[PDB]
């Protein structure tokens, strides 16, 4: 149940209900995870971060190769990885490490985890989801269309969508799981509208806007707003591969609700800390730089995360130079806290009608 509050300049402010029956604020982001954990964080350290999303993103690519053990476990992936109190959306691909392209046919899609290619027909896909038991999952889809190749991306995804719906209708396990429809069609306007209008015909719980990643062209942004125009209002709109703050804001203006949070993880992995301001009148610093060796300030003055309240730039610099994993822990805590705080500021700006100002504040720092 998606209940809106306002649509200020095409931006959807609201909350999703009946999830138990937990809730998720929109616009918002999903907690990014790799192979069943928020990277470098635990239950304890995650509890201190403020504004943690209600729902966490898992990827088939990192879990598919663990099918056997999970089916034996029976109680689903959330319980298996030790955080059963959380909601999980299971997408097909990891946004950071998607794997080699060109293995999609009208009959199977392949993902790569730590080991070897896991090729999945519809049956195998649904059999894996029966073991994972996520609350939401992306339906199997062809997102590799990037003219005649775009027509196929729609039809394969339509074919996968209806087969998965059939199998879900007769699977007791997947009854309480919500399928997300996937809009394809690549960069061909005609197919995007077709995928949009045809996927909406089916009773999916939400929509995934696939193939809009950057390298984000204003051409793609036009397709995006044209696609969201064909989509109903009462259903959530997710997007994949869009996480940088300026891109997030462009997509929110065009009706997109939910975002992946892989951006703060990427910042962490290169030894960097988010510093961009998101409240009042450079977006990151590289803690490996020698200028931080004697800098005893926190990463961000006034930040409330455990890293900033209790550790210095100097210390984190040292930890990176000696490759201690505590560096990645403290950077992940700060970067997630900063990024979730950024989304809190978006929802507050929408409430107060100041999103245009926040966009200029973000875009002058990126």
């Amino acid at each position: 149940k998606l209940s809106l509050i306002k649509v200020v300049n095409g931006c959807r402010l609201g909350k999703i209900q009946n999830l138990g029956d937990c809730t998720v604020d929109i616009p918002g982001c999903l907690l990014y995870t790799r192979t069943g954990s928020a990277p470098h964080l635990t239950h304890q350290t995650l509890r201190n971060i403020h504004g943690v999303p209600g729902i966490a993103q898992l990827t088939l690519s990192s879990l598919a190769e663990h099918h056997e053990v999970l089916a034996e476990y029976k109680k689903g992936v959330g319980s298996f990885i030790g955080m059963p109190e959380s909601l999980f959306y299971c997408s097909l691909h990891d946004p950071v490490t998607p794997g080699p392209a060109g293995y999609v046919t009208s009959k199977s899609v392949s993902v790569w985890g730590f080991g070897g290619r896991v090729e999945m027909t519809v049956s195998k896909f649904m059999a894996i989801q029966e073991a994972l038991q996520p609350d939401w999952f992306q339906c199997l889809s062809d997102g590799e269309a990037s003219i005649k190749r775009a027509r196929k991306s729609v039809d394969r995804s339509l074919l996968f969508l209806d087969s998965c719906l059939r199998l879900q209708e007769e699977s007791e396990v997947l009854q309480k799981s919500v399928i997300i429809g996937v809009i394809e069609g690549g960069d061909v306007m005609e197919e995007r509208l077709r995928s949009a209008r045809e996927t909406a015909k089916r009773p999916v719980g939400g929509f995934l806007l696939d193939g809009f990643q950057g390298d984000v062209t204003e051409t793609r942004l036009h397709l995006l707003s044209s696609v969201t125009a064909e989509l109903p209002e009462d259903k959530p709109r997710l997007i994949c591969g869009v996480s940088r703050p300026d891109e997030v804001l462009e997509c929110i203006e065009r009706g997109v609700d939910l975002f992946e949070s892989f951006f703060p993880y990427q910042v962490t992995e290169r030894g960097c800390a988010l510093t961009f301001t998101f409240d009042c009148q450079s977006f990151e610093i590289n803690l490996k730089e020698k200028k931080y060796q004697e800098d005893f300030d926190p990463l961000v003055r006034g930040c409330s995360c455990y890293c900033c309240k209790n550790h210095t730039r100097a210390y984190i610099h040292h930890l990176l130079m000696t490759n201690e994993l505590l560096a990645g822990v403290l950077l992940m805590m700060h970067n997630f806290e900063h990024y979730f705080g950024f989304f809190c500021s978006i929802r507050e700006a929408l409430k107060n009608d100041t999103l245009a100002q926040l966009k200029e504040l973000i875009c002058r720092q990126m």
């Binding site: 034996e72 990885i81 210390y315 201690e324 505590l326």
Partner: protein
């Protein structure tokens, strides 16, 4: 007119040498016997100050040689000492900087002036005198500092053993004279003398004439036989003052710990099994990379209160060891430190409750089985202090 004692004894076993005490240190009182993890081992594996505190750690080690390289003593000075640099509020113990974690390829021969470091590719050498070792540890600001000693392997023989032992006495005196603020840091002597009972006896007799707040037992755990190991430990505790702490360096195996507590030791350190996938348990260890754990959905130890055992299954740890090894190594290191701290907490509770002999018998029974299956040296060491199995 001796110096004030930093330890008080709260209970003693009537048969054995087991002691339960408290160390009144500038960053808090520490219950003994105590296992002291290396702080950088935990942080290298992503363990925070909060997590290490949460496990019950109240004193941990800093490695002076490594800290002297990165970030260096001057920077730790500007950072307000090691406590401020790493944001650690409890106690710290640092070594002299001349031996621990120093590669033999990096050392030239010891002289009376001190230890000599070599720099790569025929570069110039660096001296570490006893006076400079104390000054470095003054800058680190740790609560316990160790004398600079002349360390030789426990399996070296010949005149070098006696030579190094006597130089260690002389360097002790120089460290005492250099340490101008015993009201702020506690300097410990280190007994040497190898496996030579006469040399170690001499080192014990002479070093205890120096009024330092505590005594460590060095030179052991370097490949000697177990027969010789425990007899040297017992020789040492028989001559170290009862009213000061006994710190046994480089002993961390659970069975060794329990036996050495029974011989009268108070503090322990040891360096790492988590990298092989091993989880410490009361029957020894679990090798979680083995296929038999792939579908084992129970925790490492249902009675372990560590965050790994209250959150995760063997099956999940087994999957991560393969798929996300860095993450698994965090979880295993947290549990392995927890196990060591819980072992010593349980040891301490048994001495306060006057049931240490029964605790040892339960420990050995769980760890080995019948008396015949227990290590022969441990049976003999324990029998020498009235604990029969």
């Amino acid at each position: 007119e001796s110096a004030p004692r930093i330890m008080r004894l709260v209970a003693e076993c009537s048969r054995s040498g087991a002691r339960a005490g408290e160390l009144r240190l500038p960053h808090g009182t520490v219950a003994t016997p105590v296992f002291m993890p290396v702080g950088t081992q935990a942080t290298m594996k992503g363990i925070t100050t909060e997590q290490l505190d949460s496990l019950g750690c109240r004193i941990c080690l800093g490695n002076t040689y490594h800290l002297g390289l990165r970030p260096g003593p001057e920077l730790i000075r500007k950072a307000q000492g090691l406590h401020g640099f790493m944001n650690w509020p409890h106690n710290l113990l640092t070594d002299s900087g001349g031996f621990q974690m120093v590669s033999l390829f990096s050392l030239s021969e010891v002289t009376e002036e001190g230890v000599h470091f070599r720099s790569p590719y025929d570069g110039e050498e660096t001296l570490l005198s006893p006076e400079r070792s104390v000054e470095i540890q003054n800058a680190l600001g740790s609560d316990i500092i160790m004398q600079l000693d002349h360390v030789v392997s426990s399996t070296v023989t010949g005149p070098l053993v006696e030579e190094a032992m006597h130089r260690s006495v002389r360097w002790l005196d120089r460290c005492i004279a250099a340490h101008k603020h015993p009201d702020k840091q506690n300097l410990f002597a280190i007994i040497q003398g190898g496996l030579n009972a006469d040399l170690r006896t001499t080192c014990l007799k002479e070093m205890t004439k120096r009024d330092v707040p505590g005594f460590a037992i060095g030179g052991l755990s370097g490949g000697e036989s177990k027969a010789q190991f425990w007899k040297m430990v017992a020789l040492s505790t028989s001559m170290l003052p009862k009213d000061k702490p006994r710190y046994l360096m480089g002993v961390g195996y659970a069975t060794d710990l329990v036996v050495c507590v029974a011989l009268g030791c108070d503090m322990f350190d040891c360096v790492r099994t988590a990298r092989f996938g091993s989880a410490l348990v009361p029957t020894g260890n679990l090798q979680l990379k083995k296929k038999q754990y792939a579908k084992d959905f129970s925790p490492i130890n249902p009675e372990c209160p560590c965050p790994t055992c209250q959150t995760h299954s063997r099956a999940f740890l087994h999957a991560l060891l393969h798929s996300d090894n860095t993450t698994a190594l965090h979880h295993l290191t947290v549990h392995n430190i927890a196990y060591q701290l819980q072992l010593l907490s349980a040891v301490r509770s048994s001495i306060l409750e006057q049931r240490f002999p029964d605790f040892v018998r339960n420990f050995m029974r769980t760890m080995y089985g019948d008396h015949s299956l227990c290590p022969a040296w441990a049976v003999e060491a324990l029998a020498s202090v009235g604990i029969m199995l």
